[PDB]
RNA sequence: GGACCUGGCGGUGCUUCAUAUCCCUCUAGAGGAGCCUGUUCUGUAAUCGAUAAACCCCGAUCAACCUCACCACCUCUUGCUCAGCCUAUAUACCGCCAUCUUCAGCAAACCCUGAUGAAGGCUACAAAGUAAGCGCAAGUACCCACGUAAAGACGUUAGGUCAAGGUGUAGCCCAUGAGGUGGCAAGAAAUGGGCUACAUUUUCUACCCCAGAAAAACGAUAGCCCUUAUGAAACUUAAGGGUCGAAGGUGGAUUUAGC
């Protein structure tokens, strides 16, 4: 009951005061974040599931000592959901009498909001009622109500820097498979690209890698308008070429217009390729190749 | 009071090999060279052959120290795969955990 | 089906502690290791000796405290110090508990040539995490 | 060896073989605890450890390590063996149950009071009796022939409040629990005349089961079907006659008995209905008129019709018994007290 | 009557108590001693993490309750007597090389177990910049050629690793002797050195 | 030392001692197993080697009749086999060192033919007239100063005072010179040998000291410690020369130790008034010891503090007790507190004096600091604390003390419960204090119900029941008071007149006639003279009905 | 015998389907050759277990001696063990798993319906179901939120393992136990899986991707010889070298794996 919760609250306050004393912190300004940091330090647990780690922190009962429930819709068994439906229906009645990057929350979010359990059909009914509310030319008083149930669904660009020589430049980095590259692109240049201090046509004898390097500058029509110095390590020739391409595109984003940045993002020049080698599993030849199925 | 007579035999072999380790090392070092005369190497060969059979370190078998299993024994823990799996699954072994990646 | 270190639900009546209720694939995630020593780390030696000593300590404390250990032991090694932390029931009299603590500590210290200590945490009954 | 040893529970699980191919579908040994009679600090060497197996202080002084003599150790071993034998004998023997209608039948067997209610409700005054335990089988594709137990349970407080219920379960004890916990929520209240008998004769036909109950004076006993005897004991009826004819289905019998007993009309209800004094005439009391009921409202001055011949549907068996033509060799047989 | 368990002493504890006195040294977590209402364990559905009483998960943790920041500060205040001030005349590494050209590296290993022995601790490494030695062209060339791979031309550092002897002190003495004999032989001149 | 767990935390002092004894018994059993089966513990895996964790050896292994086996037995103290081997060696006539025979005599005299007590297989004189030590001494080929020294010391230790005198005479015949310890043993033997008056003993002690000076033998702390121990037998006369001995110590430069001051204090602790003479010694001793770290020098050092505090408790000097405690809590001096019994007695006396004299605030501070951290209080100490709290009118902590009593194994102490109940029920108090006292009384009643004296029909004190009922009435729990009125005749315990008055006072507020009449029933049952007056009050302050007044008239006729 | 209840299995159609999946379509394979390896058979005096999916480079992340449990011969008897047994039984079990599972159901505990019969409990503009718990899910590991792992209940095959170990039952106790020396293991043959290839998108060399040659040679890790490594022991292991240059010329029905 509420007595047990109040006893737990008092115990938590006393323990918080003891923790503040132990850590030497001020017992007044000893907030929840301080409590969590102190507990993590004093009881260091490396269990991956954060819910299983030690924690010091602060459902209820729907009727008093006389047995009378607090909510008039308690006997429905879903008092929160039906109260919400009743309020929405009342708002719809009021609207009828008087006359994007947002989506509806999922059933789990609705259950968390209403601390109850709801079926799929109940969720669909509530969503349809909310949609009818939205389509009814609802005012701000109901638009805020809708936004209570609404859930929201650009690439950051590095700034230009200056070097000892006086040139204006930007620097970025990228990776592909097991290769990591860091690129420096100058605002003014002559198309020279040097990888690890070596000219690109010598470090990349394969024409495909050179085409991959050309792709970012060619896309925004800036061949020969910049000078690039890249340091790449790991992977093979194609992985290094892809990493250098991604790093060069990310760095060149600092010099092209925002529209060109969006165009490059739509062209895939900025997304990091998550395709990496899949681990071999026991009982099979490769990542997916099973052994020859005998009969 | 070892697990089985095979573990008892292995214990006897280990003790005898440890007892005769230095003599075997010296005689074999006499043998394993191209400097000393061949006749001395031959008498060293017959000497090392005269040593008891169970003193040869090759006869030592790495059995599990708790079930005497001859095969499937991890050298670091000296345990068979079944016993090691049991202890690790119960969590009694520090650090060892299920591998997922 | 995987039968290793798992408790199978039959009627929702069998009480299980936190350790028993979790399958092995939860060791790194929900239940830390019952023993803590540096032997299993990288570049460290004597892992097998520590394992054998831990097994003997568990089998010895289980029989020295018959029907008293509420849950599995916790073995900690710090330098040459060994600490056995045991959750024990309150069935036995404190005189017998202290006698067993002294006896076990002295015998283990003389047997393993290390300063063994034994810390007992008493509980009224076996703590039930859930029923299966 | 030593590291190959296991725990007692694991060894018992391995030895008893509670699970396996044989025990999976039914295609003798039992667990015995070896720690019930064993005391810490007791060994075959007979050592006395101060503070563990012997008192730490003797004569107000700290005891030292002592070893029992060979004769003393023999005495201790004999005492241990005697205790083990006595415990084994006690476990082997049992308090014999009270058999029901027959030695191997489940009917009439008491189950004790029903389980207490959650909201501070106790039924310690209620007695629970089994009336039928049937094994019922069904044809399912997944499992072939599925087996279950249906149990008919009657409960009663011996003061009129009694009920019956049906429990279906895979386990017999679960069926007993379900039925006896459900019965107390279905309690009829049976009105008893003078707290020992029914108010009047009850002739009923529930489905294909005819029940004929005759009101009887004090001391007549329960001359009724054994199930009816049990149900009447649960209700609180001590004197009644009951004949069952046609189908003797136990469930139909119980349902019809409860229906008839609940539908019976009390003397007070009759007096209120017809507005006349209900007066009892007893042969043992001579011509003395005993007014057992009086109307609650105004009395009716109509002297009622003096019916020359009552148009009542008689029963042939009753008339035959009254006229003596009945000569059944089983009627009025001497029987144990009921 | 059966024995009654006393209430935990955390109830008698004060908010402004001296915690380091409660846990002076490393010790397992004791619910009767820790006043914090800490909870550990993965909660069951519609449940909460298990309380500290009988919590084996808390017992497993190598807690730092004996090493609170106040306790750390008090311990360091006590231990400041044992320390010795670093020489302020060589605050930078350049002065360190100017005054101490030879650096000795030795590794000490700490691990759980009854035996403290570890062979890996017998290794000694001697590092010295040849530019910090008194050598001429011929001596420097001869010493570099003699040491071979032990000298890195990029860093101008001679590195001698000694582990031949069982002990740390023996390996250190061997490294010093090796450096001395290498220096003296490098300054020495031999007949075969002419036919280059 | 105890396990930090609520179940295993000792409650009382007896529990503390029993738990420590059980732990020591377990350690001894483990060591007995280790020594009985050493082959299971010979495997060494400790680096560096730990000698104290290896099995020990007590039985000799040399079997030949020679000096080696005899020396092995002597160093293993196996007195029986050492004597048998020495007899065999003497029969064979083989060589034996003089030092070896001296060591044999030392072992025999120190142990007195007592085999050392391994793990397993007071009043009077412990020495025996016939022994192998005397025989070997007679058969000893050559004697030396150390031989006489050790024989005298062993005979004094075993109370062979006449034999010690004979050894002294033999030393004088040999014209050898003893040492300081031998002279101290001789002084002890001379003092304890005969029941002579003080004059002869003091003259003999002075003559022995002068003889020691003549023998070029220098004194030591043991000399003055034994002198004071001997002079303790003659307090009246020895009160004067104690200061002379102390000044002799100061002049020589032999700084008196804790045991020396303890012996001086004991000598000044003559049965009678201590203020007359101990006031001249205790303050000077404290001034000398003030701010001085000590080291173990004499066997009686550990006693000092205890004895001091005891006489401190006699002097009722809170400042002196504080000085003594500060001396104890100075550097390492706390280690001189002594054994468990001495520590318990010292802390009991100290806390009793604090409760008697110190202000109740500092008294409670000391109560928190010492109990249970230093010792578990006795029931008498808790009674004194309750008295001090009652004097300081701070009754609000009285239930808490009772809780502390339940924490310290004083739940079953009848006297403590009686004192608590009497203090609680003696005076009326505000409603919160009264209800707290009623809660404490209910807890005490539950304790009475749960006492282990239930083997015999419990003799519930009448005063306890009266006080519990009074507390229940004054708080407002009248139903339990009525039930206790019934239990009074159930337990045949006479009620209290004040209890009846409080019964009427409590029933007047609620205006309950029948509850008032029931008290008259009880009083008439016990035929107390108050009943008449009680009846009057029932007829006066209560709206008595007809049948209740009929009952009053019937009880008026019956009483 | 009457009426019901629960019933199912049917190489029985129709409409939807399957996403590396049922077929076709995609790629690379197996089925042709050699070699390697396992199995079956033959043989031996000379293990056992595994046996369609779910056995067949399986127990074994491994057999020259040991390992070893096999055979022959010899030896020992309270035996390393308060004995021992790799002796029988996985159809007595624990233990650890296969399998559907590349599944989402299993479900106690209640409530209601059928007159309180074997039973049944579905309607969302809702008409008696609720359900703890288990599993899925979720959470966690790895590089994300994806993916892969891990997980994957109850049941199914009296599924596998008494030879990991423990143990029930039964048996041996001068032997069915223990120890030593020596020894098998081959090919008429079939079969599974793997490796190398049958080449010109190749081979050799340099290089590690702008070359020069080779091209009826391509092709053995096989055979023979020799050396070396390990070991006490190499004939039987591995590595290297020399020598030999064979079968083979893209392979039938069928069949494996991959989003
Ligand atoms: Mg019968
Ligand atoms: Mg064969």
PDB file of C-alpha atoms in Angstrom, chain D residues 36-221:
ATOM      1  CA  UNK D  36      17.564 -36.534   9.417  1.00  0.00           C
ATOM      2  CA  UNK D  37      19.350 -38.570  12.095  1.00  0.00           C
ATOM      3  CA  UNK D  38      22.938 -37.376  11.566  1.00  0.00           C
ATOM      4  CA  UNK D  39      24.444 -34.854  13.992  1.00  0.00           C
ATOM      5  CA  UNK D  40      27.322 -32.528  13.147  1.00  0.00           C
ATOM      6  CA  UNK D  41      30.614 -33.581  14.701  1.00  0.00           C
ATOM      7  CA  UNK D  42      29.770 -37.298  14.931  1.00  0.00           C
ATOM      8  CA  UNK D  43      32.141 -39.758  13.282  1.00  0.00           C
ATOM      9  CA  UNK D  44      33.142 -43.397  13.487  1.00  0.00           C
ATOM     10  CA  UNK D  45      36.209 -42.385  15.519  1.00  0.00           C
ATOM     11  CA  UNK D  46      33.893 -41.092  18.257  1.00  0.00           C
ATOM     12  CA  UNK D  47      35.635 -37.783  18.911  1.00  0.00           C
ATOM     13  CA  UNK D  48      34.065 -35.116  21.126  1.00  0.00           C
ATOM     14  CA  UNK D  49      34.649 -31.615  19.766  1.00  0.00           C
ATOM     15  CA  UNK D  50      34.025 -28.889  22.386  1.00  0.00           C
ATOM     16  CA  UNK D  51      31.311 -26.568  21.125  1.00  0.00           C
ATOM     17  CA  UNK D  52      30.163 -28.559  18.082  1.00  0.00           C
ATOM     18  CA  UNK D  53      28.900 -31.967  19.251  1.00  0.00           C
ATOM     19  CA  UNK D  54      29.399 -31.661  23.030  1.00  0.00           C
ATOM     20  CA  UNK D  55      28.722 -28.739  25.385  1.00  0.00           C
ATOM     21  CA  UNK D  56      31.501 -26.166  25.274  1.00  0.00           C
ATOM     22  CA  UNK D  57      31.567 -25.828  29.081  1.00  0.00           C
ATOM     23  CA  UNK D  58      31.567 -28.690  31.588  1.00  0.00           C
ATOM     24  CA  UNK D  59      31.370 -27.832  35.301  1.00  0.00           C
ATOM     25  CA  UNK D  60      31.846 -24.207  34.291  1.00  0.00           C
ATOM     26  CA  UNK D  61      35.166 -24.993  32.592  1.00  0.00           C
ATOM     27  CA  UNK D  62      36.243 -25.105  28.958  1.00  0.00           C
ATOM     28  CA  UNK D  63      36.132 -28.655  27.631  1.00  0.00           C
ATOM     29  CA  UNK D  64      39.068 -30.166  25.759  1.00  0.00           C
ATOM     30  CA  UNK D  65      39.194 -32.604  22.865  1.00  0.00           C
ATOM     31  CA  UNK D  66      38.011 -36.024  24.019  1.00  0.00           C
ATOM     32  CA  UNK D  67      37.530 -39.396  22.339  1.00  0.00           C
ATOM     33  CA  UNK D  68      34.794 -41.808  23.373  1.00  0.00           C
ATOM     34  CA  UNK D  69      35.888 -45.260  24.478  1.00  0.00           C
ATOM     35  CA  UNK D  70      35.281 -48.263  22.241  1.00  0.00           C
ATOM     36  CA  UNK D  71      32.373 -49.441  24.398  1.00  0.00           C
ATOM     37  CA  UNK D  72      30.951 -45.908  24.490  1.00  0.00           C
ATOM     38  CA  UNK D  73      31.238 -45.643  20.705  1.00  0.00           C
ATOM     39  CA  UNK D  74      29.493 -49.011  20.382  1.00  0.00           C
ATOM     40  CA  UNK D  75      26.704 -47.662  22.593  1.00  0.00           C
ATOM     41  CA  UNK D  76      26.432 -44.530  20.433  1.00  0.00           C
ATOM     42  CA  UNK D  77      26.273 -46.632  17.260  1.00  0.00           C
ATOM     43  CA  UNK D  78      23.595 -48.830  18.835  1.00  0.00           C
ATOM     44  CA  UNK D  79      21.585 -45.735  19.772  1.00  0.00           C
ATOM     45  CA  UNK D  80      21.885 -44.397  16.217  1.00  0.00           C
ATOM     46  CA  UNK D  81      20.768 -47.738  14.759  1.00  0.00           C
ATOM     47  CA  UNK D  82      17.848 -47.895  17.199  1.00  0.00           C
ATOM     48  CA  UNK D  83      16.740 -44.371  16.278  1.00  0.00           C
ATOM     49  CA  UNK D  84      16.991 -45.170  12.566  1.00  0.00           C
ATOM     50  CA  UNK D  85      14.964 -48.366  13.011  1.00  0.00           C
ATOM     51  CA  UNK D  86      12.293 -46.558  15.035  1.00  0.00           C
ATOM     52  CA  UNK D  87      12.009 -43.784  12.445  1.00  0.00           C
ATOM     53  CA  UNK D  88      11.809 -46.359   9.642  1.00  0.00           C
ATOM     54  CA  UNK D  89       9.041 -48.207  11.491  1.00  0.00           C
ATOM     55  CA  UNK D  90       7.150 -44.953  12.089  1.00  0.00           C
ATOM     56  CA  UNK D  91       7.425 -44.009   8.408  1.00  0.00           C
ATOM     57  CA  UNK D  92       6.345 -47.492   7.294  1.00  0.00           C
ATOM     58  CA  UNK D  93       3.264 -47.465   9.525  1.00  0.00           C
ATOM     59  CA  UNK D  94       0.442 -45.021   8.848  1.00  0.00           C
ATOM     60  CA  UNK D  95      -2.724 -43.804  10.534  1.00  0.00           C
ATOM     61  CA  UNK D  96      -5.295 -45.916   8.695  1.00  0.00           C
ATOM     62  CA  UNK D  97      -7.863 -43.907   6.767  1.00  0.00           C
ATOM     63  CA  UNK D  98     -11.591 -44.265   7.398  1.00  0.00           C
ATOM     64  CA  UNK D  99     -12.984 -46.151   4.415  1.00  0.00           C
ATOM     65  CA  UNK D 100     -16.063 -44.816   2.669  1.00  0.00           C
ATOM     66  CA  UNK D 101     -18.903 -46.887   1.251  1.00  0.00           C
ATOM     67  CA  UNK D 102     -16.377 -49.602   0.379  1.00  0.00           C
ATOM     68  CA  UNK D 103     -12.683 -50.192   0.922  1.00  0.00           C
ATOM     69  CA  UNK D 104     -11.636 -49.226  -2.607  1.00  0.00           C
ATOM     70  CA  UNK D 105     -14.329 -46.597  -3.237  1.00  0.00           C
ATOM     71  CA  UNK D 106     -13.848 -42.848  -2.964  1.00  0.00           C
ATOM     72  CA  UNK D 107     -17.423 -42.024  -1.973  1.00  0.00           C
ATOM     73  CA  UNK D 108     -18.152 -41.037   1.600  1.00  0.00           C
ATOM     74  CA  UNK D 109     -14.482 -40.247   2.238  1.00  0.00           C
ATOM     75  CA  UNK D 110     -14.119 -36.966   4.105  1.00  0.00           C
ATOM     76  CA  UNK D 111     -11.775 -34.337   2.668  1.00  0.00           C
ATOM     77  CA  UNK D 112     -11.725 -31.940   5.622  1.00  0.00           C
ATOM     78  CA  UNK D 113     -12.931 -28.349   5.697  1.00  0.00           C
ATOM     79  CA  UNK D 114     -12.621 -26.298   2.500  1.00  0.00           C
ATOM     80  CA  UNK D 115      -9.707 -23.944   2.046  1.00  0.00           C
ATOM     81  CA  UNK D 116     -10.197 -20.578   3.793  1.00  0.00           C
ATOM     82  CA  UNK D 117     -11.468 -17.624   1.815  1.00  0.00           C
ATOM     83  CA  UNK D 118      -9.218 -14.683   0.949  1.00  0.00           C
ATOM     84  CA  UNK D 119     -11.264 -11.892   2.554  1.00  0.00           C
ATOM     85  CA  UNK D 120     -11.064 -13.320   6.061  1.00  0.00           C
ATOM     86  CA  UNK D 121     -13.494 -16.173   5.383  1.00  0.00           C
ATOM     87  CA  UNK D 122     -13.101 -19.574   7.039  1.00  0.00           C
ATOM     88  CA  UNK D 123     -15.147 -22.732   6.487  1.00  0.00           C
ATOM     89  CA  UNK D 124     -13.898 -24.803   9.421  1.00  0.00           C
ATOM     90  CA  UNK D 125     -17.537 -25.563  10.287  1.00  0.00           C
ATOM     91  CA  UNK D 126     -18.052 -27.253   6.901  1.00  0.00           C
ATOM     92  CA  UNK D 127     -17.429 -30.935   6.220  1.00  0.00           C
ATOM     93  CA  UNK D 128     -16.491 -32.188   2.759  1.00  0.00           C
ATOM     94  CA  UNK D 129     -17.513 -35.579   1.371  1.00  0.00           C
ATOM     95  CA  UNK D 130     -16.765 -37.278  -1.936  1.00  0.00           C
ATOM     96  CA  UNK D 131     -19.696 -38.786  -3.831  1.00  0.00           C
ATOM     97  CA  UNK D 132     -18.192 -39.992  -7.127  1.00  0.00           C
ATOM     98  CA  UNK D 133     -14.752 -40.128  -8.743  1.00  0.00           C
ATOM     99  CA  UNK D 134     -14.874 -40.931 -12.460  1.00  0.00           C
ATOM    100  CA  UNK D 135     -12.036 -41.327 -14.939  1.00  0.00           C
ATOM    101  CA  UNK D 136     -13.121 -39.616 -18.168  1.00  0.00           C
ATOM    102  CA  UNK D 137     -11.265 -40.068 -21.451  1.00  0.00           C
ATOM    103  CA  UNK D 138     -11.339 -38.040 -24.656  1.00  0.00           C
ATOM    104  CA  UNK D 139     -10.089 -38.704 -28.182  1.00  0.00           C
ATOM    105  CA  UNK D 140      -7.569 -36.030 -29.189  1.00  0.00           C
ATOM    106  CA  UNK D 141      -5.346 -36.209 -32.258  1.00  0.00           C
ATOM    107  CA  UNK D 142      -2.320 -34.753 -30.460  1.00  0.00           C
ATOM    108  CA  UNK D 143      -2.211 -37.153 -27.492  1.00  0.00           C
ATOM    109  CA  UNK D 144      -4.442 -40.079 -28.461  1.00  0.00           C
ATOM    110  CA  UNK D 145      -6.587 -40.813 -25.402  1.00  0.00           C
ATOM    111  CA  UNK D 146      -6.514 -37.988 -22.851  1.00  0.00           C
ATOM    112  CA  UNK D 147      -7.362 -38.929 -19.259  1.00  0.00           C
ATOM    113  CA  UNK D 148      -8.933 -36.684 -16.626  1.00  0.00           C
ATOM    114  CA  UNK D 149     -10.748 -37.024 -13.302  1.00  0.00           C
ATOM    115  CA  UNK D 150     -14.254 -35.726 -12.605  1.00  0.00           C
ATOM    116  CA  UNK D 151     -15.161 -35.616  -8.917  1.00  0.00           C
ATOM    117  CA  UNK D 152     -18.558 -34.916  -7.358  1.00  0.00           C
ATOM    118  CA  UNK D 153     -18.132 -33.295  -3.939  1.00  0.00           C
ATOM    119  CA  UNK D 154     -20.781 -32.423  -1.358  1.00  0.00           C
ATOM    120  CA  UNK D 155     -20.066 -29.982   1.471  1.00  0.00           C
ATOM    121  CA  UNK D 156     -22.163 -28.987   4.456  1.00  0.00           C
ATOM    122  CA  UNK D 157     -22.044 -27.405   7.910  1.00  0.00           C
ATOM    123  CA  UNK D 158     -24.531 -29.782   9.527  1.00  0.00           C
ATOM    124  CA  UNK D 159     -27.000 -26.928  10.035  1.00  0.00           C
ATOM    125  CA  UNK D 160     -28.936 -26.760   6.772  1.00  0.00           C
ATOM    126  CA  UNK D 161     -26.371 -25.031   4.566  1.00  0.00           C
ATOM    127  CA  UNK D 162     -25.050 -27.609   2.109  1.00  0.00           C
ATOM    128  CA  UNK D 163     -23.958 -27.709  -1.509  1.00  0.00           C
ATOM    129  CA  UNK D 164     -22.395 -29.815  -4.227  1.00  0.00           C
ATOM    130  CA  UNK D 165     -19.933 -29.250  -7.048  1.00  0.00           C
ATOM    131  CA  UNK D 166     -18.059 -30.972  -9.867  1.00  0.00           C
ATOM    132  CA  UNK D 167     -14.296 -30.752 -10.275  1.00  0.00           C
ATOM    133  CA  UNK D 168     -12.418 -31.659 -13.455  1.00  0.00           C
ATOM    134  CA  UNK D 169      -8.655 -32.012 -13.246  1.00  0.00           C
ATOM    135  CA  UNK D 170      -5.664 -33.965 -14.477  1.00  0.00           C
ATOM    136  CA  UNK D 171      -4.739 -34.705 -10.845  1.00  0.00           C
ATOM    137  CA  UNK D 172      -7.146 -36.247  -8.347  1.00  0.00           C
ATOM    138  CA  UNK D 173      -6.157 -33.963  -5.462  1.00  0.00           C
ATOM    139  CA  UNK D 174      -6.522 -30.915  -7.709  1.00  0.00           C
ATOM    140  CA  UNK D 175     -10.018 -32.098  -8.639  1.00  0.00           C
ATOM    141  CA  UNK D 176     -10.879 -32.521  -4.953  1.00  0.00           C
ATOM    142  CA  UNK D 177      -9.604 -29.025  -4.171  1.00  0.00           C
ATOM    143  CA  UNK D 178     -11.441 -27.429  -7.098  1.00  0.00           C
ATOM    144  CA  UNK D 179     -14.748 -29.137  -6.347  1.00  0.00           C
ATOM    145  CA  UNK D 180     -14.689 -28.530  -2.594  1.00  0.00           C
ATOM    146  CA  UNK D 181     -13.683 -24.883  -3.025  1.00  0.00           C
ATOM    147  CA  UNK D 182     -16.397 -24.354  -5.645  1.00  0.00           C
ATOM    148  CA  UNK D 183     -19.131 -26.068  -3.615  1.00  0.00           C
ATOM    149  CA  UNK D 184     -19.081 -23.502  -0.797  1.00  0.00           C
ATOM    150  CA  UNK D 185     -20.056 -20.816  -3.320  1.00  0.00           C
ATOM    151  CA  UNK D 186     -23.132 -22.874  -4.323  1.00  0.00           C
ATOM    152  CA  UNK D 187     -24.650 -23.532  -0.898  1.00  0.00           C
ATOM    153  CA  UNK D 188     -28.347 -24.272  -0.788  1.00  0.00           C
ATOM    154  CA  UNK D 189     -30.036 -23.755   2.567  1.00  0.00           C
ATOM    155  CA  UNK D 190     -32.247 -26.735   3.407  1.00  0.00           C
ATOM    156  CA  UNK D 191     -35.032 -26.074   5.897  1.00  0.00           C
ATOM    157  CA  UNK D 192     -35.289 -28.827   8.514  1.00  0.00           C
ATOM    158  CA  UNK D 193     -38.389 -29.485  10.600  1.00  0.00           C
ATOM    159  CA  UNK D 194     -37.380 -29.468  14.284  1.00  0.00           C
ATOM    160  CA  UNK D 195     -33.771 -29.362  13.009  1.00  0.00           C
ATOM    161  CA  UNK D 196     -33.800 -33.116  12.343  1.00  0.00           C
ATOM    162  CA  UNK D 197     -36.052 -33.948   9.367  1.00  0.00           C
ATOM    163  CA  UNK D 198     -37.727 -32.636   6.237  1.00  0.00           C
ATOM    164  CA  UNK D 199     -40.964 -30.683   6.506  1.00  0.00           C
ATOM    165  CA  UNK D 200     -43.030 -33.030   4.321  1.00  0.00           C
ATOM    166  CA  UNK D 201     -42.800 -35.926   1.897  1.00  0.00           C
ATOM    167  CA  UNK D 202     -41.017 -35.022  -1.340  1.00  0.00           C
ATOM    168  CA  UNK D 203     -41.692 -36.890  -4.586  1.00  0.00           C
ATOM    169  CA  UNK D 204     -39.483 -35.716  -7.437  1.00  0.00           C
ATOM    170  CA  UNK D 205     -38.264 -36.921 -10.828  1.00  0.00           C
ATOM    171  CA  UNK D 206     -34.986 -35.311 -11.897  1.00  0.00           C
ATOM    172  CA  UNK D 207     -34.286 -36.480 -15.452  1.00  0.00           C
ATOM    173  CA  UNK D 208     -34.611 -40.272 -15.162  1.00  0.00           C
ATOM    174  CA  UNK D 209     -34.138 -40.508 -11.372  1.00  0.00           C
ATOM    175  CA  UNK D 210     -37.135 -40.639  -9.033  1.00  0.00           C
ATOM    176  CA  UNK D 211     -36.548 -39.690  -5.397  1.00  0.00           C
ATOM    177  CA  UNK D 212     -39.233 -40.361  -2.780  1.00  0.00           C
ATOM    178  CA  UNK D 213     -38.468 -38.854   0.632  1.00  0.00           C
ATOM    179  CA  UNK D 214     -40.656 -39.573   3.656  1.00  0.00           C
ATOM    180  CA  UNK D 215     -40.625 -37.395   6.756  1.00  0.00           C
ATOM    181  CA  UNK D 216     -39.955 -39.558   9.792  1.00  0.00           C
ATOM    182  CA  UNK D 217     -40.091 -39.037  13.567  1.00  0.00           C
ATOM    183  CA  UNK D 218     -37.095 -38.641  15.835  1.00  0.00           C
ATOM    184  CA  UNK D 219     -34.935 -41.728  16.233  1.00  0.00           C
ATOM    185  CA  UNK D 220     -35.999 -43.349  12.957  1.00  0.00           C
ATOM    186  CA  UNK D 221     -32.494 -42.822  11.568  1.00  0.00           C
TER     187      UNK D 221
END
